[PDB]
Symmetry: D2
Subunit: 115 residues, 4 copies
């Protein structure tokens, strides 16, 4: 699968499980159309978001519902969500992993692009 | 100064200078109203975005134009921008520092909220 | 395997491959004795460092040779290495993943502890 | 002030106050000589560690006592400390800011080097 998401919890030192993730693609009219979504597994990973045929070049937005994650744990969060926006460009075979590390008042995200 | 933004460059180990920052506020009709904008200084800091009177309760979006930053350095970056979304002043006025650390394929953001 | 290391490159958006990793355990005389070592694979992962029988409770040090990594890429690094020091404590079945995200002037590390 | 340290708490979104910081310098006999130490202030900043005259070229180690910080907050953290090791002033005197962002199972560190 060409697009995978991984979410970690920096407070409990664990995968962030059951985190809702929504993927949008930028449309011609510059609005965000829903493209794919899911929830992270017990490993904190979300697989099977899309397929190679559907994942074309374009501008994508990945919204991670961090606020619901923290509220389910009884921990007070700062952000409404974590939003990752990027251009996917074919430059040879590419697989994208979007990884996020979450704290109540901070998040880090990084992209791992492999052949 | 109720809202301040600080941006660092993890590649060169320096302040990220002249980074454009745009602040939006969610309006009654659920759209993003432009609220304030500016550029980081030579210290990587952006002061004077707003005032105590203007910075009311609401949902705010801080969009840091990381892509233009890297491209001005001749680097093709992964993200379009770094976007921080949060509810402000829900329990009275606070002072918010939004700090961002930038790499071409990664960023971290953190919030410092003081009374 | 009870202890795994994963290293990512925030500049190129990729696994950090062929990164030397050394594990030390704190000895009775408070000196660091060599315990295990290896190099990250093409996925940026180092498996097979130790076994369940050998990985007892104690204070461990994980040294990641970030400086050699950056020098092999022709990129100017700040740190001599990335060093992660922690106490491993049996509290039920535990597997430890030490993950590191590298930039020339910054690194992040996090621990993922799972059952 | 050639060497400054700043520490933030990613859980509470605040400066990490009263964090002990110890600086060592690698000696001729390849041991770590104690060089300077202090505690972060109410702003999370530690100033006045050393002087321009005392901060000569060398390999330095900044050990941030994160464990005592979390334990004073009643939290059992993963790391013993956060340790930053770097060669300083190799091409003349520089000003170094060592910034650290803390979570119970994670930390990030970054260096800001200015002339
Ligand atoms: O920016 C982040 O979200 C991040 C992600 C990782 C990470 C990435 C991929 C993976 F398979 C495991 C990880 F811990 C490791 C460190 C890190 O800061
Ligand atoms: O998440 C981030 O954006 C981040 C921020 C800092 C940091 C905090 C305070 C400061 F004055 C400068 C900084 F880089 C240090 C590390 C880091 O990952
Ligand atoms: Ca193209
Ligand atoms: Ca209110
Ligand atoms: Ca025990
Ligand atoms: Ca010299």
């Amino acid at each position: 699968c060409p697009l995978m998401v991984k979410v970690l919890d920096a407070v409990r030192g664990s995968p962030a499980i059951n985190v809702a993730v929504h993927v949008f693609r930028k449309a011609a009219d510059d609005t965000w159309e829903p493209f794919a979504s899911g929830k992270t597994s017990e490993s904190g990973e979300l697989h099977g978001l899309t397929t190679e045929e559907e994942f074309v070049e374009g501008i994508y937005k990945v919204e991670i519902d961090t606020k619901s994650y923290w509220k389910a744990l009884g921990i007070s969060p700062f952000h409404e969500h974590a939003e990752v926006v990027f251009t996917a460009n074919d430059s040879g075979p590419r697989r994208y992993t979007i990884a996020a590390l979450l704290s109540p008042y901070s998040y880090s995200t990084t992209a791992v692009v492999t052949n």
